[PDB]
Design a protein around this ligand. Structure first.
Ligand SMILES: Cc1cc(N)c2ccccc2[n+]1CCCCCCCCCC[n+]1c(C)cc(N)c2ccccc21
Lengths: 186, 186
């Protein structure tokens, strides 16, 4: 509970004032915990944030599980997951805190350790889509891990570096990418 | 050097840390100057940054022009451009500071007359490659603009969101991307 509260309040603070401006001091006092209890559950701001991040990935996955019901075939899952990545991320309040966090502990394989099991999870969604695509004969992929990392990162890029363009155009471009790319597997 | 000597410090600081962790003061301090020398061609912080981006972009485009000769067919110009994007020391090492820069300075109306100029040079390489390929018959592209923007960002995605792993796994992934993308076009 005190741990659940630290997480809840911290998430709001990072959302309101970003990663850098938020202090464990603010988190401790507003969550009504202490520096000791905080230190025992998370050790560091970095770690607390990674934990919030894991919780968010779980939420995403549950969202994805209910959402893909709208996409029968794996080909459709791929179109929908990318469109979903773009539209949701546009109004995801933690995106700014995340950007800050990455640039922060990038030259530290420490606060970039669990950062792996995390990104790996993002990519798994693609892995499932492509593995099943293979079994369902929708396509034939040499090695899924490679194609999954590529799809995962090409999509982050279209989502991230487009920010400067009408949302309707963005979706149209992403769908075009989904189309061209799936066409490079046949 | 007055003007052309600050940008060098600011670049280092912008790349080393973020667009936020680098402040007007830290520059001048490690640059030894007046916190006002910025106005002739350096209006606001965003302008100093927006300028550094141009220098670096052009530096990258310069190199590209000199190395794209190892590529015979345009189909090859596409792979080489993407492979080189992973290895350059120009502009791409700044994509990070650029991301966090859009999570702030993107409301004013300079980020549409100054910032739009730079994005053109960013998708131009792909425009030339995709047009000359059309003219040459290597493929038939519906709208070179869509495919160009889609490609530039995808690639930037693979370069920027994997900047923490074996550079060879990198090259591998990028080449597999180029293969699939082009196989999706033609
Ligand atoms: C709840 C929830 C709700 C949503 N509506 C949602 C929408 C879209 C995506 C996730 C969502 N989730 C939860 C999402 C948890 C996401 C964990 C993501 C880890 C990945 C980012 C990796 N990364 C790398 C490698 C390298 C970089 N240079 C870099 C630079 C800037 C930013 C990121 C960078």
């Amino acid at each position: 509970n005190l741990k659940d509260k630290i997480l809840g309040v911290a998430k709001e603070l990072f959302i309101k004032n970003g990663y850098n401006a938020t202090t464990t001091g603010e988190i401790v006092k507003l969550s009504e915990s202490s520096k000791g209890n905080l230190y025992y559950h998370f050790k560091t701001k970095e770690n607390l944030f990674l934990e919030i991040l894991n919780i968010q990935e779980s939420k995403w996955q549950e969202q994805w599980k209910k959402e893909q019901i709208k996409a029968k075939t794996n080909r459709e899952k791929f179109y929908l997951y990318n469109e979903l990545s773009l539209t949701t991320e546009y109004y995801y309040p933690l995106q700014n805190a995340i950007i800050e966090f990455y640039t922060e502990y990038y030259k530290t394989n420490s606060i970039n350790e669990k950062m792996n099991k995390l990104e790996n999870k993002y990519i798994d969604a693609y892995h499932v889509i492509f593995k099943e695509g293979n079994l369902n004969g929708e396509w034939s992929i040499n090695d899924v891990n490679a194609v999954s990392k590529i799809a995962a990162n090409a999509v982050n890029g279209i989502v991230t570096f487009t920010h400067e363009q009408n949302i309707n155009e963005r979706i149209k471009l992403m769908n075009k990418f989904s189309q061209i790319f799936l066409n490079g597997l046949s």
